[PDB]
Design a protein around this ligand. Structure first.
Ligand SMILES: O=S(=O)(O)O[C@@H]1[C@@H](O)[C@H](OS(=O)(=O)O)[C@@H](CO[C@H]2O[C@H](CO[C@H]3O[C@H](CO)[C@@H](O)[C@H](OS(=O)(=O)O)[C@H]3OS(=O)(=O)O)[C@@H](O)[C@H](O)[C@H]2O)O[C@@H]1O
Ligand SMILES: O=S(=O)(O)O[C@@H]1[C@@H](O)[C@H](OS(=O)(=O)O)[C@@H](CO[C@H]2O[C@H](CO[C@H]3O[C@H](CO)[C@@H](O)[C@H](OS(=O)(=O)O)[C@H]3OS(=O)(=O)O)[C@@H](O)[C@H](O)[C@H]2O)O[C@@H]1O
Ligand SMILES: NC(=O)c1cc(-c2ccccc2)cc(-c2ccc(S(N)(=O)=O)cc2)c1N
Lengths: 352, 303, 50, 50
């Protein structure tokens, strides 16, 4: 009857656990994490397997699994906001003095009574790195979803941004042919019907106002920039994730298994003496590990980088909206200064 | 994998035996011809253990006896391995460890007279040198005696002291060891040990280098390999198990050997003072004429 | 692609309609209010009432 | 695959329908500016000659 939420740090390959109480909130937990990570409480963006971001709404009871089992499964992946790219703060587990003999001495004749352990642990270490790689890989997969979601969120406003501008340009036209439409009907009556002088400039301004406007085209710095990123993201989806070569490592796993298998099922024991063979699988797994390991982070640096690029253009979207809606509102109520100003200037002789 | 990642001047071939998490490695220079090996630090050595490592390199550089592991200056590639820790450069020997010559089928039953005595004049001198610096290496096990073809003859050399005790800043280094089999019964009680603890380690090997196995119960875990010989009759240097599982003791030198019909008389007696359970009694006779005990007396009397 | 290319311009063309309807619905009735308050002070036309 | 083509070509004409209809009002309401503005100037000299 406990929580204990496992947290995988996608910046140090660490798996810190937190036994959260049935009351604490995530905002109360984020601080705890900061004590064992060093990541600013505000720059702590934890993503789950679903790729979804954190969840300031619900408390700290958003990791209780009760479908598959409820332990060592629903592990969250902690992502840092400040760090654009992840170097190598991560670390791994040692083989202990128990397996060191197998690697240092290589070819040594050790009693099977002991081999049944040094080999066992060795095999566990082998598969360990492998299964450990999967955890890290999933982090990228989750982070990928977050980026894929941000891209959609950003684009969703684009469709409404250009759509909002289309209203501006549509109104400007229905304004430019309405503002000067009065000028022609005026110039031909500056002596007949009505003619003043105070509104000679009052109206002349409205026309120049809609000019300095026009934000429908200003979307260019955005349109061809949100797409250059949009396609870029889906283009990066082409590149190889990380588990692409994870299988090659899984092969090494099966190897070690075969050795530990031929360690017990082999023709008798309790006297056997050998260990040089294991060295094989051991060394290979190590090389493969560190190779695709930092390699995975590389293909992640791009993914993690595109997010800030989307979030950096996110505010620029509101700018366009606000600016386009600014004129969309001004020009809108300008109808009175173009119509109502005619009725106010109508009773000039309606009382003679 | 000592990391490094510093270009690629030198380059390690293969690792070595005991030592610890990724101990010494055969470091050869792809460019030059030097192949001196250096020890690599384990993972995150404890703060308290940190002084232990810096200690070894200290006393190691004090040993200049080219008859044992030498401590050559660290090459251009210094830096620090896992965490804040230096390194330990030293002479390399392709002659392999002593266990090699011991496992050789040709010497399946005791090495040959030449190699035998050639080990006493060697290890016996080095083991003595260490005693001339208050440095006592009790873990003197066969898998710690490297060999080298210095010129033409085989040169035996002691190595690794990450366990040995001393007197200066750094009393001892570690209590227990690994798969013990060649060590005085002193450290088996953790009681006040002595400086003769080394004499036993050396003696036991000398015997094996003539018979081909332990001086008592071979392949028998030291756990019970002790109580059975706990008393170990005086001057006894052998005790195997009869075909009927029985146990037999003897202060003589088993057969077949490789020593002549003359070297036997002294060899047996020598092993006797080197194989005496009582610590402060192994070679007690310290003739003030040679400053050394009857242990090194007979040795020099033989060689 | 050809079909969709017109969709982007179809919805874009409609956005103009809705944008104009708004700038028309607030302009057509904008006169009604300025008229109802002068049907006996300024000028009360009946032919343009419909 | 061959079937989806006719489905696209079948909706192809429906597109011109939307465009024409949207542009129809886009044009009508556009020139409706005169019946909402110009009709004020025509109905302005009612007393500009008294
Ligand atoms: O046991 S042996 O030493 O006798 O043979 C080793 C093999 O057991 C081991 O696995 S396997 O080939 O039998 O399946 C191999 C490969 O292990 C290394 O794996 C990578 C490096 O990849 C090596 O193999 C790939 C093809 O799978 C090549 O493309 C690589 O060439 S290259 O891309 O580096 O230019 C090749 O690298 S290598 O030439 O340096 O070996 C790393 O994890 C390590 O290099 C090894 O684990 O190795 C022996 O043949
Ligand atoms: O188990 S066996 O008895 O069948 O073979 C043993 C070898 O495994 C072992 O080699 S190793 O595992 O330690 O690396 C040796 C140790 O060396 C001993 O013998 C060499 C001389 O070796 C000569 O003969 C061998 C076998 O024919 C050759 O391979 C050597 O050529 S090479 O590999 O060095 O290029 C050859 O060396 S030589 O050309 O210089 O004569 C001695 O030098 C060592 O001092 C011995 O310890 O033990 C068994 O042979
Ligand atoms: N500098 C060295 O030449 C050296 C150093 C060591 C060593 C150094 C520090 C700690 C433990 C071992 C071991 C061997 C050895 C240990 C075992 C073997 S082998 N192949 O097992 O016979 C070969 C040599 C060394 N040769």
């Amino acid at each position: 009857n406990l929580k204990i939420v496992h947290i995988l740090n996608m910046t140090s390959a660490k798996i810190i656990s937190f036994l959260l109480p049935p009351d604490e909130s995530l905002h109360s937990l984020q601080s705890r994490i900061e004590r064992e990570t060093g990541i600013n409480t505000g720059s702590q963006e934890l993503l789950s397997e679903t790729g979804i971001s954190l969840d300031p709404r619900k408390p700290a009871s958003q990791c209780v699994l009760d479908g598959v089992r409820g332990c060592d499964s629903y592990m969250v992946y902690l992502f840092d906001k400040s760090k654009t790219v992840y170097e190598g703060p991560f670390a791994s587990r040692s083989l202990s003095d128990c397996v060191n003999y197998i690697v240092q001495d290589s070819k040594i004749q050790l009693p099977i009574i002991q081999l049944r352990k040094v080999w066992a642990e060795a095999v566990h270490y082998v598969s360990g790195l492998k299964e450990d790689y999967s955890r890290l890989f999933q982090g990228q997969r989750a982070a990928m979803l977050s980026l894929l979601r941000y891209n959609a969120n950003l684009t969703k406003m684009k469709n409404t941004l250009i759509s909002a501008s289309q209203q501006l340009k549509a109104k400007l036209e229905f304004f430019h042919k309405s503002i000067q439409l009065d000028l022609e009907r005026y110039s031909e009556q500056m002596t007949y019907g009505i003619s003043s002088e105070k509104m000679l400039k009052a109206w002349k301004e409205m026309e120049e106002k809609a000019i300095h406007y026009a934000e429908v085209g200003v979307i260019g710095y955005l349109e061809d920039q949100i797409m250059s990123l949009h396609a870029e993201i889906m283009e990066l989806q082409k590149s190889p994730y990380g588990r692409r070569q994870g299988d090659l490592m899984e092969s090494l796993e099966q190897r070690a298994i075969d050795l530990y298998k031929q360690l017990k099922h082999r023709p008798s024991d309790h006297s056997y003496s050998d260990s040089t063979e294991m060295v094989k699988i051991i060394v290979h797994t190590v090389q493969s590990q560190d190779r695709v390991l930092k390699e995975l982070f590389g293909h992640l640096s791009k993914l993690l980088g595109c997010k800030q690029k989307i979030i950096d253009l996110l505010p620029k979207v509101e700018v366009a909206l606000s600016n386009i809606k600014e004129a969309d509102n001004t020009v809108m109520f300008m109808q009175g200064k173009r119509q109502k100003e005619i009725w106010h200037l109508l009773k000039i002789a309606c009382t003679q | 994998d000592p990391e490094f990642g510093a270009g690629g001047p030198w380059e390690m071939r293969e690792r070595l035996g005991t030592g610890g998490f990724g101990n010494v490695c055969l470091y050869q220079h792809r460019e030059l011809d030097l192949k001196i090996a250096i020890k690599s630090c384990r993972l995150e050595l404890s703060t308290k253990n940190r002084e232990r490592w810096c200690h070894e390199i200290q006393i190691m550089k004090k040993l200049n006896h080219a008859n044992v592991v030498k401590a050559c200056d660290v090459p251009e590639e210094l830096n620090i391995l896992i965490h804040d820790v230096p390194l330990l450069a030293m002479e390399y020997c392709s002659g392999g460890d002593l266990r090699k010559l011991l496992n050789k089928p040709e010497n399946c039953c005791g090495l040959k007279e030449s190699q035998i005595l050639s080990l006493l004049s060697d290890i016996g001198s080095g083991i003595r040198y260490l005693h001339e610096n208050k440095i006592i290496h009790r873990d003197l096990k066969p898998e710690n005696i490297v060999l080298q073809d210095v010129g033409g003859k085989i040169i035996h050399k002691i190595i690794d002291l990450g366990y040995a005790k001393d007197v200066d800043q750094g009393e001892l280094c570690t209590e227990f060891v690994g798969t013990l089999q060649y060590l005085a019964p002193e450290l088996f009680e953790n009681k006040p040990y002595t400086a003769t603890v080394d004499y036993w380690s050396f003696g036991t090997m000398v015997f094996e280098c003539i018979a081909g196995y332990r001086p008592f119960l071979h392949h028998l875990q030291p756990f019970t390999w002790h109580e059975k010989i706990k008393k170990k009759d005086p001057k006894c240097i052998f005790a195997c198990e009869e075909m009927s599982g029985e146990v037999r003791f003897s202060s003589h030198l088993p057969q077949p050997n490789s020593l002549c019909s003359l070297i036997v008389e002294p060899m047996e007696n020598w092993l006797q003072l080197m194989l005496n359970w009582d610590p402060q009694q192994r070679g007690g006779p310290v003739d003030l004429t040679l400053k050394q005990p009857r242990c090194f007396v007979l040795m020099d009397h033989i060689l």
